[PDB]
Amino acid sequence: HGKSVTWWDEHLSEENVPFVKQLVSDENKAQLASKLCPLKDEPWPIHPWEPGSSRVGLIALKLGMMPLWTKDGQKHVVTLLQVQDCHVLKYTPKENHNGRMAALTVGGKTVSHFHKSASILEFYQELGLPPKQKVKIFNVTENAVIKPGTPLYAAHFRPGQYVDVTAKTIGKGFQGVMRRWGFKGQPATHGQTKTHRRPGAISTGDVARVWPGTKMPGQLGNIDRTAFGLKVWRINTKHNIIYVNGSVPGHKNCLVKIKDSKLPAYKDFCKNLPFPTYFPDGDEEALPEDLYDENVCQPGAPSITFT
Amino acid sequence: ISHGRVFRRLGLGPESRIHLLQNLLTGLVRHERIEASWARVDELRGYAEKLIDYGKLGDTNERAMRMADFWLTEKDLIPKLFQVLAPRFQGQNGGYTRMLQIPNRNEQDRAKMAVIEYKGNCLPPLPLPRRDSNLTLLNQLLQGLRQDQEASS
Amino acid sequence: RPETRFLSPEFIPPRGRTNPLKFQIERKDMLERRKILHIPEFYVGSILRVTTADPYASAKTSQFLGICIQRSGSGLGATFILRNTIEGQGVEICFELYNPRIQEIQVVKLEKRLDNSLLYLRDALPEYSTFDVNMKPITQEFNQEVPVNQLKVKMKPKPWSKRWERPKFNIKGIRFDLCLTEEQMREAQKWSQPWLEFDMMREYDTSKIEAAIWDEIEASKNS
Amino acid sequence: AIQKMTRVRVVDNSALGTTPYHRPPRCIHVYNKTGVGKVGDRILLAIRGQKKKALIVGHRMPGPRMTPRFDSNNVVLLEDNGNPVGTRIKTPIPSSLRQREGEFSKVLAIAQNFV
Amino acid sequence: AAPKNRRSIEVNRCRRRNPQKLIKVKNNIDVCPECGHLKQKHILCGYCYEKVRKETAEIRRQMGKQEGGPFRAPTTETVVLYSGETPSEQDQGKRIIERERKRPSWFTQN
RNA sequence: CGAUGUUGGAUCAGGACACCCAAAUGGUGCAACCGCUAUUAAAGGUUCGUUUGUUCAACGAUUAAAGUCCUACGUGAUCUGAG
Ligand SMILES: [Mg+2]
Ligand SMILES: [Mg+2]
Ligand SMILES: [Mg+2]
Ligand SMILES: [Mg+2]
Ligand SMILES: [Mg+2]
Ligand SMILES: [Mg+2]
Ligand SMILES: [Mg+2]
Ligand SMILES: [Mg+2]
Ligand SMILES: [Mg+2]
Ligand SMILES: [Mg+2]
Ligand SMILES: [Mg+2]
Ligand SMILES: [Mg+2]
Ligand SMILES: [Mg+2]
Ligand SMILES: [Mg+2]
Ligand SMILES: [Mg+2]
Ligand SMILES: [Mg+2]
Ligand SMILES: [Mg+2]
Ligand SMILES: [Mg+2]
Numbered sequence: 001h002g003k004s005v006t007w008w009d010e011h012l013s014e015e016n017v018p019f020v021k022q023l024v025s026d027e028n029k030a031q032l033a034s035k036l037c038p039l040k041d042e043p044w045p046i047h048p049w050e051p052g053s054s055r056v057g058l059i060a061l062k063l064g065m066m067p068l069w070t071k072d073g074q075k076h077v078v079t080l081l082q083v084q085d086c087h088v089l090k091y092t093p094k095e096n097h098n099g100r101m102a103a104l105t106v107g108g109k110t111v112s113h114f115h116k117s118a119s120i121l122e123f124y125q126e127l128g129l130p131p132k133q134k135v136k137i138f139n140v141t142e143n144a145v146i147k148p149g150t151p152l153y154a155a156h157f158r159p160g161q162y163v164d165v166t167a168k169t170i171g172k173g174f175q176g177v178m179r180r181w182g183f184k185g186q187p188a189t190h191g192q193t194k195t196h197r198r199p200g201a202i203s204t205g206d207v208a209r210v211w212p213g214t215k216m217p218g219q220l221g222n223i224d225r226t227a228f229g230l231k232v233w234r235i236n237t238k239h240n241i242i243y244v245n246g247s248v249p250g251h252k253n254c255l256v257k258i259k260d261s262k263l264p265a266y267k268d269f270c271k272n273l274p275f276p277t278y279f280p281d282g283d284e285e286a287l288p289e290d291l292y293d294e295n296v297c298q299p300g301a302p303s304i305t306f307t
Numbered sequence: 308i309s310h311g312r313v314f315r316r317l318g319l320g321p322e323s324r325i326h327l328l329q330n331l332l333t334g335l336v337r338h339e340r341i342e343a344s345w346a347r348v349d350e351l352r353g354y355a356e357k358l359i360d361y362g363k364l365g366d367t368n369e370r371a372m373r374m375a376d377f378w379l380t381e382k383d384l385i386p387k388l389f390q391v392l393a394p395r396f397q398g399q400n401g402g403y404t405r406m407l408q409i410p411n412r413n414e415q416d417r418a419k420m421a422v423i424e425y426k427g428n429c430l431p432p433l434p435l436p437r438r439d440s441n442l443t444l445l446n447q448l449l450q451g452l453r454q455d456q457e458a459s460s
Numbered sequence: 461r462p463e464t465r466f467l468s469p470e471f472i473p474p475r476g477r478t479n480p481l482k483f484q485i486e487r488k489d490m491l492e493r494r495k496i497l498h499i500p501e502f503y504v505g506s507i508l509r510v511t512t513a514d515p516y517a518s519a520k521t522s523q524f525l526g527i528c529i530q531r532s533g534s535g536l537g538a539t540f541i542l543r544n545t546i547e548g549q550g551v552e553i554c555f556e557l558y559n560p561r562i563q564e565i566q567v568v569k570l571e572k573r574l575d576n577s578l579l580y581l582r583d584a585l586p587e588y589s590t591f592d593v594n595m596k597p598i599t600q601e602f603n604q605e606v607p608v609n610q611l612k613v614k615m616k617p618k619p620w621s622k623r624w625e626r627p628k629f630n631i632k633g634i635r636f637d638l639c640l641t642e643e644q645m646r647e648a649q650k651w652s653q654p655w656l657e658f659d660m661m662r663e664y665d666t667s668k669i670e671a672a673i674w675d676e677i678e679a680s681k682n683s
Numbered sequence: 684a685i686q687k688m689t690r691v692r693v694v695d696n697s698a699l700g701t702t703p704y705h706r707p708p709r710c711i712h713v714y715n716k717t718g719v720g721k722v723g724d725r726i727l728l729a730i731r732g733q734k735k736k737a738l739i740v741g742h743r744m745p746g747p748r749m750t751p752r753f754d755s756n757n758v759v760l761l762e763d764n765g766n767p768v769g770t771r772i773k774t775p776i777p778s779s780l781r782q783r784e785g786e787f788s789k790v791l792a793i794a795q796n797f798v
Numbered sequence: 799a800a801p802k803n804r805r806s807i808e809v810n811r812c813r814r815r816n817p818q819k820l821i822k823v824k825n826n827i828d829v830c831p832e833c834g835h836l837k838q839k840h841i842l843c844g845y846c847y848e849k850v851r852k853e854t855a856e857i858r859r860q861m862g863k864q865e866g867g868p869f870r871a872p873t874t875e876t877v878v879l880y881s882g883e884t885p886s887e888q889d890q891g892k893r894i895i896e897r898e899r900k901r902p903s904w905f906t907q908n
Numbered sequence: 909c910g911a912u913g914u915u916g917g918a919u920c921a922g923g924a925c926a927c928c929c930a931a932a933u934g935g936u937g938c939a940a941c942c943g944c945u946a947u948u949a950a951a952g953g954u955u956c957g958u959u960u961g962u963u964c965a966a967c968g969a970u971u972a973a974a975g976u977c978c979u980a981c982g983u984g985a986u987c988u989g990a991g
């Protein structure tokens with residue numbers, strides 16, 4: 001039984017392809033609109049905040065980098081993380097996951113149905129949401145659990161806060177030792193023959209082998225890295241965008257896993273933040289379009305002068 | 308590390324790549340359909356589209372005239388470019404060229420070949436890959452689903 | 461006589477694959493900043509006086525006047541370089557257009573030059589960079605269409621900061637005949653790249669982008 | 684940026700900085716943990732065949748925005764206790780040097796022009 | 799560097815019979831609906847393309863014989879017509895190539 | 909001795925502690941600052957230049973310090989050939 005390869009457009013006609021496309025688009029729109037009211041159908045009970053509580057995170061998109069100015073005159077550079085479509089997919093109990101914290105699975109931006117596997121498509125069909133690109137697991141406390149299918153917004157974080165940003169860094173492929181490890185090269189022109197960038201000696205004569213920790217040319221860049229303690233300066237609620245201080249690992253337009261800072265200096269700033277998550281349908285009062293920090297020079301400013 | 312590179316290296320350098328591209332473009336403009344290596348034709352497709360755009364830009368435009376003069380090595384094709392190709396591409400926007408992969412060459416190199424062709428020319432049509440008819444089983448099921456959608460709408 | 465339309469160079473997004481939403485938001489922020497700070501029309505070669513909040517000066521503000529060497533950057537990070545010779549010491553300051561510390565930008569002489577970047581003024585004679593710190597502003601009327609100053613500049617002896625004779629700079633504002641020789645020009649022409657002018661795939665067409673930019677600008681002004 | 688073996692120009696009116704010599708004043712040592720010197724960094728000079736201390740006033744490397752970029756590597760000569768040997772500085776000096784007035788009081792007192 | 803010892807046939811077989819070195823089977827092969835010959839799904843049929851290329855070669859030979867010079871590029875549109883056919887009201891004002899062969903089934907009148 | 913290719917330098921260093929710095933202490937003929945000794949600790953560091961092929965050595969400017977050694981006086985199928 002020599003079965004041949006197939007795809008979704010192989011057997012469709014010139015008139016059914018637009019029909020299938022629009023049918024899937026309408027289904028995705030309806031599914032996304034069904035979840036816009038997570039607090040009125042059957043939300044899970046909300047627990048009070050505790051000193052040792054941990055919150056869920058988001059999966060945003062690294063848009064770009066923008067300058068920003070502080071009221072004291074300094075200039076920082078911020079990265080734009082846009083929460084396109086962030087949802088809670090599944091929940092895993094603490095004893096069944098780690099024995100210390102529960103696991104909440106969070107999915108990022110939407111992708112096409114026609115290029116996902118049967119198991120993934122079935123899982124998203126049972127869940128009731130269109131497939132996501134990036135899926136991550138967050139370790140939260142049992143009092144911060146959220147019902148799967150709940151959307152998440154950039155208002156989950158607030159201006160003035162420290163966050164941890166995890167992403168796959170820009171992959172530079174098989175790089176030489178000089179760029180991978182910062183090794184100094186051999187001199188350029190004083191007689192050296194074909195050794196201007198070689199690592200040189202790699203071990204010792206007596207050992208008669210090279211140690212497992214030897215720095216040698218290889219892959220560089222396409223690995224997961226986390227930046228710790230990035231300050232949040234600004235929140236654009238209309239477009240769901242976070243202005244995080246400094247640089248962010250990964251290329252632009254990549255999926256970025258963002259969560260609260262785990263450094264000991266910023267352990268208990270979860271008190272003033274919305275503990276379970278941000279529910280736009282609960283307060284019954286729209287947030288401002290832009291929420292700024294106490295030191296950000298807003299675009300509409302009196303053109304600060306020193307006294 | 309070649310992130311964000313749009314032009315592939317061909318020939319003996321950038322000038323050699325430009326000369327190869329202009330030879331291919333002259334052949335394409337003259338014959339209305341040529342075949343070559345897949346990479347060279349893929350590179351040439353964009354230049355062909357931009358040349359048709361420059362021809363649509365006008366005969367009296369000095370910039371377009373100089374660009375055509377440079378790119379068309381045979382000088383008898385510039386009147387053809389400005390009086391045949393551009394008149395028949397007026398309502399269109401970017402669908403000027405058609406590129407299709409053909410079987411590899413017969414000789415030992417076995418290169419991957421493509422054929423590029425200005426649309427609406429005076430040549431036998433290529434064996435274009437046609438989609439299935441609505442009379443197929445799956446297409447008929449989709450048609451019935453569409454009919455019920457329209458009825459419920 | 462009709463009226464011509466001038467868009468600031470910083471409003472044009474770069475060629476990269478950045479999402480247009482970032483450009484939209486950056487334009488919104490920079491238009492909001494322009495609502496407060498009146499950023500006038502100026503090109504490379506225009507003479508500008510910039511007032512910046514200086515916390516350590518005798519007065520709380522400091523004024524710097526100079527000719528604009530170059531304008532570079534996209535969106536909120538746009539910068540322009542002002543050059544002036546102060547008591548025989550050439551000084552260059554790279555101002556940021558949308559920095560809140562700037563109080564006022566004043567065009568004291570709106571003019572164009574033969575080049576889009578007057579970086580060769582470092583190697584030029586000091587008389588071409590010396591400007592009166594207290595010159596009165598020269599008003600201009602619209603029907604002058606910002607006249608181009610066809611000024612050819614003498615140069616100091618070689619070497620210069622860069623190889624301005626090379627074709628990669630495409631400079632028309634230097635009197636090369638009095639500083640170089642025909643042999644030197646013949647050697648310099650070996651670096652020419654004639655195919656770049658007719659590549660026609662390296663060109664960046666931004667007609668629709670500029671139309672959308674100005675539509676947003678008009679919407680902001682009406683709002 | 685001023686580092687070792689860099690020729691500089693003395694700005695203040697001093698006998699060492701004015702009397703002609705067959706060797707330009709070169710930088711002997713920069714007093715940072717790095718070998719590079721920026722505006723306001725004490726460095727060592729070999730003027731007229733003797734060792735002297737100087738302060739970097741302006742350099743030709745671009746720095747942060749709204750910072751003056753001069754056409755020469757300007758230095759003002761200093762003493763062992765940190766006081767200038769000259770009486771007046773004619774060339775413009777960056778206004779950021781006034782931030783650290785605690786240790787450059789006598790140096791900024793003789794400065795006349797700030798940019 | 800020179801090999802220290804002769805590599806045995808067992809190691810040689812383990813190296814050059816690995817699935818990485820073996821030829822992979824192609825699962826994108828189908829029959830062309832027109833002529834029944836084999837073709838790949840993403841590649842034009844060899845038989846049909848040979849037919850079209852040959853017919854184009856004959857047409858180009860005729861239209862090059864019609865022109866007495868190498869630089870005589872027509873400045874008007876071009877139409878190919880076969881035996882037993884006459885130019886229509888829309889084909890007037892163009893250049894015409896006449897072929898003695900009958901019109902092929904695949905060549906649409908348009 | 910049917911070949912274990914050499915000093916010094918470049919690149920990369922693994923290790924020991926008989927610790928130069930950084931850390932915790934005991935005694936001082938330890939008033940304080942500088943110091944002199946001894947105990948414990950080897951995760952991390954231990955500069956740039958003139959002359960000399962130089963390892964060393966003298967000298968200039970600094971540093972928290974510019975440690976002693978082993979590794980075929982580490983490392984020439986990675987490099988130099990100044991001796
Ligand atoms: Mg890559
Ligand atoms: Mg090097
Ligand atoms: Mg040699
Ligand atoms: Mg070499
Ligand atoms: Mg050799
Ligand atoms: Mg061993
Ligand atoms: Mg090649
Ligand atoms: Mg230079
Ligand atoms: Mg002497
Ligand atoms: Mg022997
Ligand atoms: Mg032997
Ligand atoms: Mg070591
Ligand atoms: Mg011990
Ligand atoms: Mg100690
Ligand atoms: Mg050690
Ligand atoms: Mg020995
Ligand atoms: Mg040895
Ligand atoms: Mg060896």
Ligand SMILES: [Mg+2]
Binds near residue numbers: 984
């Ligand atoms: Mg050796």
Ligand SMILES: [Mg+2]
């Ligand atoms: Mg060798």
Ligand SMILES: [Mg+2]
């Ligand atoms: Mg010798």
Ligand SMILES: [Zn+2]
Binds near residue numbers: 833844
């Ligand atoms: Zn066929």
